[PDB]
Each structure stands twice: as C-alpha cells, then as structure tokens.
C-alpha cells in the first residue's frame, strides 16, 4: 500500500497548478506551481492579528500544519522540515529528517511548544518550537498527526488492524499515552472525486483537537467523530456528533444536492468552523470563500419523518427537543470531564457548562410534557429521572399537575425527597 502525505484539510492539484497545503481555524496555506519551484502563500482569517505573507519554495513542501504561533512545512521525500514563526521576532529554522529506503514523511504537526513528524515506517520524531529534538520513537506506521499544546493525536495504519489511533501527552518529563493504538471506527471510502482519493486514500478530510481539547476526525463519510471519555481507557467512545450531509439536506429544504459540500476546519464547542464548497468537486477552490459555521446535531433525525412535518426545513418542536436533549447531554458530559481534569482554557467554560445544563433540563422537560400529553406516565417518570437541576424536578411536578396525573406527581416527589436525603449524608 502507498502512504500519502497528509495535512489537515489539504486539497489536491487536480487539473490546476495550485492546491491548499493545510487549512484550519487560523487560516489557509496555498502552494502554486512556479516553473520548477513553488510559491507558498500563508493567509489568515483574523487579518488584524497576523499579516499574510508568501515565500518561494525551493524544496517542494507537500506537508504543512498551521497553528496560532507558527507554520510548519514538510517535504515527504527529501525529509526536510521548516518552521516559520508568524512573528519576525522568532527565527525560522530548518531540519532534515533521516529517511530509510522508501521511507516517507506522512504527516507533520506543530503547537507553540512542540513539533511532530511521523513517517511511513512508524518513526515518531518530536522537537520543541526551536528544533531541539526530544526523542525518536518507533510506533505503527503513521498516516495522520494533529496536536494541541502538549498533546498529540496520531492515526496509524497496519495491514492487520486497519486504522487505529493513539492519544499521548508530551509533558516536560516523558511521553505518556492516554490511549495506545485503539480502534479508529472512521468509515473508509467505498468517479469525479477520484483525484481526491488518490491524494488522500483514507479520506481523512481533516482531524483536530476541539477547542476544549477533545480529539475529532472528519472522514470521507462527512460525519464529524468526537472521542469521548478518552481520559478513562475503558470508557472511550467515538461519538458521531454531526452528519454534515444531513445539515446540507436540511439547509436545502429537503432537496438532494450534489454541488454543496463541507470542508472541516475546527470544532469550537458546538460549532464546526468549515468552508462551504459549491461546485463539481468536493474540495475548495481559489479564491477561498469565507468560513461558515455549522452547529453540531446528533444524527437522530429521519428524512422520512422530517418531510411529513413540513407538509429551509422546519423541525417539529417535540422532535427538536429530543435532539437538543441528546446534544446537551453529550456536550455537558464532555465539558464536565474537561473541567474536572484539566480546568479552564478560555474563561467561559464554567458559564457555558451552566447554560448547557440549563438547556439540557429545558429540552428534557419538553419531552416530559409530550409524554404527559400522551398519558404515558411510565415514559414521563423515566424522563424525570434524567433531569439534572432540582428546580427542574419541581417544574416537572407542576407540568404533571397541569396534566392531572397525581400518580406521577407522587413518584416524582419521591425522587425529590430521595435527592434531599442524599443532601443530608
């Protein structure tokens, strides 16, 4: 099998002389064929912070990774990497990665504190932001790398297991694994887009850490997968949190399209920063459109049931409450895990979590109301058990009173009393 050089959200040349090297929430890096050399252009989305610049590529960099402090460039065949800090204060530096017979650099990644290089033989070479090597490690063949601060998310491919992943932390002391070569349940590809799947065989459009530090991957099935509970190895689950094919289907008012596609940049809490590509090909073109925002939605909507309720798609409140319940549940569980182990990162996590739990109960209480409407005392009680705030248990009692279900009211008041007596222990 042929390992191909990977970069987050990179596009292929196709029939042109220019492609995007990499692309995320910070900006986009393009390369243009220039006779026998290349013209690399680093551009940013926050024009106030950083100044777009460009330079002449005499090596043929086909690997790139962009962060908020610098840009990392890599040449898959010669093994040459270069790190260009955004500020002119810090100097550029260049290294040449040793490569054996047929060994290729398959993915590079960089944070403000770490530089990561992965090869097709499974060499995991790490450096600091200045190029000082920390240690060379041999793992399974690496196909994709992303990083954030001191943590690395790596995707591996053997001929035995298929696609696995590893999640590690490059602390000050040594490298520690949170997850080691666990199965990566990303759907592989199964044509006008053949140019893409020759350039990216796995179909990994992008992969990245979320804004709150959770690993995310975006495969050819256009579903955003998020890794939950990665701090407890026996509890790790990959959760599909966005069917972008469905969001486009719902934007278009139930009409099937073939010219609208999503290109993932990053995940900020509940919003997928992306590029909406309109055209024949699934990857963005020149010039690059302005980034769009797509709110994550749990894949629980059925096309059949959504067409009936319309007769942009309108969602019935009772059905949207179920999806909002699930989505709030997942986000609340993920953010609490973050705060309970790593603390805050942006300054609004505690406020987000508070409003998140609020939206959880409010959506859950709507489902509770619908169950009382259908006289479903049993289903309602099970829903009330899933309520978080005690003030929402009270709100359920008042909803049960308006439904004249005194049998339910007493059983919910038993829940409230049971929680009050745990407040006494």
């Amino acid at each position: 099998f042929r390992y191909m050089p990977f970069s987050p959200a990179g596009t292929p040349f196709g029939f042109t002389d220019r492609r995007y090297l990499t692309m995320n929430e910070v900006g986009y890096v393009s390369t243009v064929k220039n006779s026998e050399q290349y013209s690399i252009t680093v551009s940013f989305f926050d024009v106030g912070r950083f100044r777009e610049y460009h330079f002449e590529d005499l090596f043929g960099y086909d690997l790139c990774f962009l962060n908020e402090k610098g840009t990392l460039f890599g040449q898959s065949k010669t093994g040459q990497i270069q790190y260009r800090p955004h500020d002119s204060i810090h100097s550029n530096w260049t290294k040449i990665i040793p490569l054996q017979a047929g060994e290729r650099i398959t993915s590079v990644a960089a944070t403000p504190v770490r530089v990561i290089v992965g090869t097709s033989l499974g060499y995991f070479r790490s450096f600091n932001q200045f190029g000082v090597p920390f240690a060379v490690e041999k793992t399974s063949p690496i196909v994709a790398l992303t990083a954030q601060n001191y943590r690395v998310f790596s995707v591996h491919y053997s001929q035995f297991h298929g696609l696995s992943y590893s999640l590690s932390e490059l602390g000050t002391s040594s490298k520690r694994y949170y997850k080691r070569e666990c199965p990566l349940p990303m759907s592989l590809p199964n044509d006008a887009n053949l140019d893409y799947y020759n350039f990216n065989p796995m179909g990994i459009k992008s992969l990245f850490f979320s804004s709150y530090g959770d690993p995310c991957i975006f495969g050819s099935d256009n579903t955003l997968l998020l890794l939950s509970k990665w701090r407890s190895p026996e509890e790790s689950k990959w959760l599909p949190i966005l069917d972008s094919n469905m969001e486009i289907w719902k934007m278009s008012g139930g009409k099937e399209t073939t010219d609208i596609h999503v290109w993932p940049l990053a995940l900020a809490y509940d919003t997928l920063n992306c590029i909406l590509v309109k055209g024949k090909h699934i990857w963005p073109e020149f010039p690059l459109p302005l980034p769009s925002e797509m709110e994550i939605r749990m894949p629980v909507f059925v096309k059949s049931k959504l067409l009936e309720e319309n007769k942009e798609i309108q969602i019935p409140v009772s059905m949207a409450a179920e999806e909002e319940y699930l989505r709030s549940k997942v986000l609340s569980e993920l953010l609490t895990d973050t705060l309970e182990n790593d603390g805050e990162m942006y300054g609004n996590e505690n406020e987000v979590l508070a409003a998140l739990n609020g939206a959880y109960d409010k959506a859950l209480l709507r489902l509770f109301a619908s169950a009382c409407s259908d006289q479903n005392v049993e289903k309602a009680l099970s829903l009330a058990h899933e309520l978080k705030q005690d003030r929402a248990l009270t709100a359920a009692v008042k909803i049960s009173e308006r439904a004249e279900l005194p049998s339910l009211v007493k059983k919910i008041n038993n829940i409230r009393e049971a929680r009050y007596e745990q407040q006494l222990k």
Partner: peptide, 13 residues
C-alpha cells in the same frame, strides 16, 4: 395548556 410551558420553563432561572 401543556403545549406552552414557557411560563414554567422560564421560572427555573
């Protein structure tokens, strides 16, 4: 009565 519960939902705050 049960369809509009915003009078109850907004009291939680």
């Amino acid at each position: 009565s049960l369809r509009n519960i915003d009078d109850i939902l907004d009291d939680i705050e």
